[PDB]
Amino acid sequence: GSFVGSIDQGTTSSRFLIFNGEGNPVASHQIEFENLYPKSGWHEQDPYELLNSVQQCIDGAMHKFASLGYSKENIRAIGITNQRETTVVWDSVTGEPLHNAIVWPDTRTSALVRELKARQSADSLLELCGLPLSTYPSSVKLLWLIQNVDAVKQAYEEGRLAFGTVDSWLIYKLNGGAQAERPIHVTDSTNASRTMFMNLRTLQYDDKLLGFFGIDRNKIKLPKIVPSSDPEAFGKVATGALAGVPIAGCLGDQSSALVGQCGFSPGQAKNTYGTGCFLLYNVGTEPVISKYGLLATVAYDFGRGRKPVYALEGSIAVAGAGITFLMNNLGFAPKPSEINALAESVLDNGGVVFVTAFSGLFAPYWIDDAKGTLFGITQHTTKGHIARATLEATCYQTRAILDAMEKDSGHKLESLAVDGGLSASDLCMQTQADISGIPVDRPRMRETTALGAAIAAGLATGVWRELDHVKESIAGAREVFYPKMDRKKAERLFRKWEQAVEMSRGWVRE
Amino acid sequence: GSFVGSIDQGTTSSRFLIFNGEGNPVASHQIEFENLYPKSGWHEQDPYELLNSVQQCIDGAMHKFASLGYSKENIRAIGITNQRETTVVWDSVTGEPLHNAIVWPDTRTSALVRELKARQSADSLLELCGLPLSTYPSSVKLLWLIQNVDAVKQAYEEGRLAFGTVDSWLIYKLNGGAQAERPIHVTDSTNASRTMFMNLRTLQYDDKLLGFFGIDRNKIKLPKIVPSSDPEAFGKVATGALAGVPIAGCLGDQSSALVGQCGFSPGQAKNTYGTGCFLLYNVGTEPVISKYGLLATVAYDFGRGRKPVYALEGSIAVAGAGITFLMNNLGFAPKPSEINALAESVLDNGGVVFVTAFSGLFAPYWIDDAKGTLFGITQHTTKGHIARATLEATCYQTRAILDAMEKDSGHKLESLAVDGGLSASDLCMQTQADISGIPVDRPRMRETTALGAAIAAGLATGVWRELDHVKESIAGAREVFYPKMDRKKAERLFRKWEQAVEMSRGWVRE
């Protein structure tokens, strides 16, 4: 085989891509799928909607792959990357779902979270798994399912409840599920680090963590934790257009994006833009527990003797949602490209600062009583000024998180790569370079997340020997944005932002 | 002979010592000499005040060595240890200095430093020589002397400029200067690793580095880089009371201190206390370039078919200067022992934390916009609480550097030896033991720096055969401080220190 495939199963879409030995994609196919919102704050997906979304993406890509004259016999292996924390529960016996998957943004577990935070044993969870208690981790999601869904209750007590993040589910069913010789139930170190069940330092399940949530190892079937790159642990695709092709790579989507940007050295960071932002910061071979509310997580675990690598993670809630706000809520323009144009139409922000704290501010600010607050409005303020401030808001929060990441880890920021969404805005990336004082790399190959899983698979099957080889091959209409602004003008702009953040505190009273 | 002599030429004093075969001094003589400070931030010494001082200690100590019944015939060899980075320039053909030596803390090179740091070239220096650009290394001091002192630039162009660190200067004159048959112009690997001229991995001058500073090796006379322990490369003392005694050892003072503590295995560290601290960390035969602003230097190069050993170095500005601050600035007490008594008169710090960032904080924090910040004051805070917080402040910063060295090198801390100044405070060292969680070793033999050079000369000439022999022979108030505190209580104290540090950054706005 000479090519590597990659399944990228996201929150709203699935895609399948096939890469060559240099990381460039030759065949691709994407599929939107249905998300379900039974009540406000609830968010679920049919596990079979996710799987068949993937099989229709494989089918579509390989028809295009076939039109170029290639066969499955040429795909050496595939990797999998997936939306993290999304929780699937199925019957160990029949491999059938016992409930809809609860997707990571679901908030039905709020009450449960407040309950678990009132424990005293909760004080020590951050240090053991790298994450604080919240509505996101798979643990609170699965505990809620057991305590509130009877068919899940029975299976747990009867000893036939199987748990998995989306990666585990996909690999299980792709191998054949219950109807299979050598059934495959596993998860890689990056996905398993998002559940709150795993010790971050040992990369093994921890009974202090399991016991805190009342989950019994010897009742529920937990996926076995394996490296993110392995030639055997994930098995092979049993059926379909890819029958007989081995699965050899598996990575959480935000980890896969960092791998796809070749952020393999301490201090190399990546920002993925969608409705919001996910930022990851390579910290090396020793995990770093945050003093600022950042998440400590696994960057990648490629094995073959090498030590696993960790990362710090931060997130912003409002990045592309800011543009959506300007277009729909305020009616500035009907397309995001015309929003950029309005921003480029003015020289600067006109003194406007948009603290886009629609649901408050998160790392590193942790301000829960502020709402969206717009400063600096005069009779001379125009839509372009506000559009600029909306872009800058994302860049200011990005610096705030990267600053925290430098302080948490002690490494100076070495590089910043960007992909997705708002990264297409030259103006926004240029502002990020200006505000942070660092080159901003934006690859032209836009499917960075999927490439990460392809690298993981290629490394397990000999397409690439080491990570130097990965960098060399990948390296081998604009790419890098370089700072233009005086560093003292940059601090001044950033200090105005922080003044506005402090002034936004205390809006919501009770 | 069975005895070994050691020249310890310090920043403000010279001393000559004679050690027996188990590392105990049998004769000593010390002389304070003249430093000079024409302009603020300038620091100079007459190269003959340094050598004359050395000669007077040799004379003074051999007069006492005679009272014991011994003479130069009983001294197998002598070694030399010295203030590092201090730059000496002299004329090749006459052997007379061209200008006063520039002591290492001189700051006249700052402008030139920011000149050379602006070049993209500078990024490659640290990985090349293990050091970043600063005002300390001899490179910028020599370049300044060439670019700004005509007597030196003229000797440079006329091909008779000779450069040397103090070690090289002393060995050259002791051997007889220019009139000597077989003139000796050399420097040991540890001293040469402080100039920024030497490749750290190869222990040879590097044209790439000499080029960066515009230094022509076919025009300037650089000292030959030799091992720290050699029975012939340093020659012999030409005249005086040690006429005929070979010189066979040479180490930078901080490196000599590590040797004198027998810090020979990876992970063994030492700390020397004065106005501040110099910490060294043995990392083994493979050099380690720091991610946290620490310096990569040579620990010792003992030759004899053994690979050289490297180390990581960190420095703290405020250790004894903190005690001095409490006495003079705040008037707590006229003597240091009373400051200590005040700290001992309370059970703990009373919640007080003193971030002693008088001119900011340095490795591994690197905070340039913080001043001294005292936290936790109530109407119950007394001098003793603030005295304790001052001592803990240097221990906290000490732990922060040792943690950074562990992470950089991969080697767990095996031990910590202390010497000088504040190490005499039983309380401070017990506090360090409590905070770091390991035993703290403090030799009753106080002259650890001078022992290092004696060890080098002894290994060169058979007094000690191997490094194991050294450890055994020198294994023969108080000596060892053991942790009297949980890791959990210690971690709480360190977290509040790090919180104080975080709350101190951002004080200076312009």
TrEMBL record, chains A, B:
GO biological process: glycerol catabolic process; glycerol-3-phosphate biosynthetic process; triglyceride metabolic process
Transferase among keywords: yes
SUPFAM superfamilies: Actin-like ATPase domain
GO MF annotation, one: ATP binding
Pathway as given in its UniProt record: Polyol metabolism; glycerol degradation via glycerol kinase pathway; sn-glycerol 3-phosphate from glycerol: step 1/1
UniProt domain Carbohydrate kinase FGGY N-terminal: residue ranges: 5-260
UniProt EC number: 2.7.1.30
CDD domains cross-referenced by the UniProt entry: ASKHA_NBD_FGGY_GK1-3-like
GO CC annotations, alphabetized: mitochondrion
Swiss-Prot/TrEMBL keywords: ATP-binding, Glycerol metabolism, Kinase, Nucleotide-binding, Transferase
NCBIfam families named among the record's database cross-references: glycerol_kin, PRK00047.1
Name of this chain's protein: glycerol kinase
Organism: Chaetomium thermophilum (strain DSM 1495 / CBS 144.50 / IMI 039719)
